[PDB]
Design an enzyme around this catalytic site. Sequence first.
Site, PDB file in Angstrom:
ATOM      1  N   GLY A   1       0.747  -1.269   0.000  1.00  0.00           N
ATOM      2  CA  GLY A   1       0.000   0.000   0.000  1.00  0.00           C
ATOM      3  C   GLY A   1       0.774   1.315   0.000  1.00  0.00           C
ATOM      4  CD  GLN A   2       4.369   0.081   1.214  1.00  0.00           C
ATOM      5  OE1 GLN A   2       3.827  -1.041   1.339  1.00  0.00           O
ATOM      6  NE2 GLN A   2       4.652   0.865   2.248  1.00  0.00           N
TER       7      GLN A   2
END
Length: 420
Positions: free
Chosen positions: A312-313
């Site tokens: 999820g970066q």
Amino acid sequence: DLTKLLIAEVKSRPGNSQCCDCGAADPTWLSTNLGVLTCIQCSGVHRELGVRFSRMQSLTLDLLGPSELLLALNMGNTSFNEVMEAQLPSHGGPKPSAESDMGTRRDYIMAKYVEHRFARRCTEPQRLWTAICNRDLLSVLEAFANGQDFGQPLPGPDAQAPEELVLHLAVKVANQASLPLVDFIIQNGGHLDAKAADGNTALHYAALYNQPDCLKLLLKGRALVGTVNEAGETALDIARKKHHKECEELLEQAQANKEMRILMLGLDAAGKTTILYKLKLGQSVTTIPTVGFNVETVTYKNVKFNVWDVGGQDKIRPLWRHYYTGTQGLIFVVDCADRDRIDEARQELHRIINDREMRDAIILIFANKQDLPDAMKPHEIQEKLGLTRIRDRNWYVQPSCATSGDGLYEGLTWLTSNYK
Ligand SMILES: Nc1nc2c(ncn2[C@@H]2O[C@H](COP(=O)(O)OP(=O)(O)O)[C@@H](O)[C@H]2O)c(=O)[nH]1
Ligand SMILES: [Mg+2]
Ligand SMILES: [Mg+2]
Ligand SMILES: [Zn+2]
């Protein structure tokens, strides 16, 4: 490109070429609220302690604003450990190396940041008032390390009939250089919406003493506007009296057999892998930031689940579109203690369900991390995520605690059900 420099600048601080916690080869993971750097291995433990203690972003992988880098550019690992790893012996000290096992790793880091064992010790209301005005960041950190609690106030100097609290002061006596502490305090003793003596919020004070960049930092941390005091004034009202026009410009804008292919998204450290692997193993495993993505097949009640957990970066979210095709159910994991980034989770969730390649998707939302202190309960998630006004789409917010497992199988049970 403005940031490229500040990135390089953060990295070159004293000690920032070794992991803050295990000294590993030049780290890339920043604890934005402490201004320190850890290797990917230590990094994960921080994500486990939660945004209350540590907000992790990657220098390589997250999109970082200049403002987020403040403490990073003003602390660094040597400054920090001098305080936090102060009373640590050089020989045999429990501080791990590049590749100690997660066992030893976890224990130390938890003791260090949560329990504060290895920190220079002493109480103290006196020093804190002195350090702030001295602009002595490193002593404010010393205060924090002994459990000071910036919450309740301090008795002041001459004619001490009234009472002021920590943050309220730091905002009054600040300049460009004084800033770091303001942030360190906001992000670490977050009694941001306190009213003090005459009902003035910390927001109020900033509008009285020509402290512009203070206002900036305050709102950045989701601050309440227009709350009235003893004089019944909105933060803008006091800005009007003294006519500090720069403050006023910012205040104005502040107003406004069955098999299922599952895709599991959500922001960084939402719990995505924790969920995926607790379901697959039944035992809670420790998770490092998932740099790519993970695929596991979980069967629950004669139904096969093809789960695609994606990292999820900020930088690895445009990659999501690729995993849209052939997708039946969506699991959007939300870290509920992360009150500062809910509108971010709102945006990305909406950014998916609205994609053309998705209209026929069942949506399960895990409202993860219900065990953590200030939770943010599932109904409050529905409202904040803008699900009130979603019709013609099939969703369901599910309370969850991946660590234990509570609510996980239920979400699947809902998936089973609405897949008819
Ligand atoms: N207290 C608590 N911590 C959790 C929960 N779910 C996940 N975590 C922790 O949050 C950190 C991030 O977990 P992870 O699966 O890596 O999040 P992800 O990267 O988005 O997949 C991990 O160290 C987990 O131990 C929860 O329900 N409660
Ligand atoms: Mg960001
Ligand atoms: Mg993950
Ligand atoms: Zn490390």
